[PDB]
């Protein structure tokens, strides 16, 4: 089957540069107009740029005009998106998509897409999280607050994986400071609060930080 692979995603400082690439499997790009699309955190789609066959026409969205450059290499079957003067608002999943149909016409839909690459534009630097307990007051709850870290992601386990039932790790929230924050919670019986031990295990691979935090009533 036809496959498209985006690469080159990652972290960029606000005002920096990054080049995305899109490669393929089981087809040649030469007869296809190729496009870049991005999924904004909402999560709708936004057309970014298009490059026609032979690089004759290059069209860009108003939000990216003059800052983004689309290019293609038909011999090797690669499409590029060179991004300059990157803004925090360029943070998104970027997809490469082929314009096509069973029989090629002057105006076809996007018949094949890649799975996307995450692009995160931020003035922040690698920062390990602070790990605070969420202490309990029939059924009770306890947790861990994982705050002021960068970049995403962070892993959270309870009692080294022994406690999985009733576990909820929330999606991270972007704070005004440009650092992420997340909570992980577990529902447990009120009677077990003084008897059972509850330990949250936090892992942040980018800063090589592993934290074990015991959660007890205050």
């Amino acid at each position: 089957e036809v496959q498209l692979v985006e690469s080159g995603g990652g972290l960029v400082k606000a005002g920096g540069s990054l080049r995305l690439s899109c490669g393929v499997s089981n087809f040649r790009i030469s007869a296809h107009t190729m496009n870049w699309v991005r999924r904004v955190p909402g999560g709708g789609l936004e057309w970014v740029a298009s490059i026609s066959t032979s690089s004759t026409y290059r069209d860009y969205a108003d939000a990216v005009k003059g800052r983004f450059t689309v290019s293609r290499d038909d011999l090797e079957d690669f499409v590029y998106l060179q991004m300059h003067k990157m803004r925090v608002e360029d943070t998104a999943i970027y997809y490469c998509a082929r314009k096509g149909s069973d029989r090629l016409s002057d105006n076809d839909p996007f018949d094949a897409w890649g799975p996307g690459t995450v692009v995160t534009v931020s003035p922040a630097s690698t920062k390990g999280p602070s790990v605070f307990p969420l202490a309990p007051s029939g059924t009770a709850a306890l947790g861990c607050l994982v705050k002021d870290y960068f970049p995403e992601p962070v892993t959270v386990s309870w009692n080294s994986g022994a406690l999985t039932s009733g576990v909820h790790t929330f999606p991270a929230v972007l704070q005004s400071s440009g650092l992420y924050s997340l909570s992980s919670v577990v529902t447990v019986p009120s009677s077990s609060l003084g008897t059972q031990t509850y330990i949250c295990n936090v892992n942040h691979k980018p800063s090589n930080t592993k934290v074990d935090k015991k959660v007890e009533p205050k």
Binding site: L45, W47, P109, T187, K218
Partner: protein, 212 residues
Amino acid sequence: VVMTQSPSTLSASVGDTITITCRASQSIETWLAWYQQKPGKAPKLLIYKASTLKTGVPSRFSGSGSGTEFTLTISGLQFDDFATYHCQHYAGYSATFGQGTRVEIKRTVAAPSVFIFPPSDEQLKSGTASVVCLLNNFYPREAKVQWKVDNALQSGNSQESVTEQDSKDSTYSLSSTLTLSKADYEKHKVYACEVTHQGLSSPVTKSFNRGE
């Protein structure tokens, strides 16, 4: 051209007939496509030229309309159809998309279980206090969390995060975090989270007094 999709969220059960509308700001003839997308996955083309079904797509998917009004109908929704659907106006060298419609699994109304968490003494030394409110295993997704500090309503100092619909029980969980400076936190005594949801006949307020 501006594409507007309605509704933004659609609740449904297996076997239901559902409809998604796309309205264009100006006439686009039949230059419209519909895509399906699952979280963290590539979009998939379903229908193009407003009503042509892509080869391989199940016949329960149908597209209709022209000019400024378009509809995507799923006749007999199947388990694999719970996803986000996007409409697109496509031209020779550009395209525009609607905002997307998420189709979610319908289940019986379930009230949230509510818990409040005070900030830790350890956090106060950092100069900030985070008060957390947890709303556990509820349905539908709509819920209102109101923060009260000394019986006064808070605004703009809280952020919410919601889990994806649970694969086992089709419920949602939500965390609401109220962030205050150490000075503002220590200035007040009673901290409360007041929750309202369809599953409740009375509002649920969880509270604590700083310093117990």
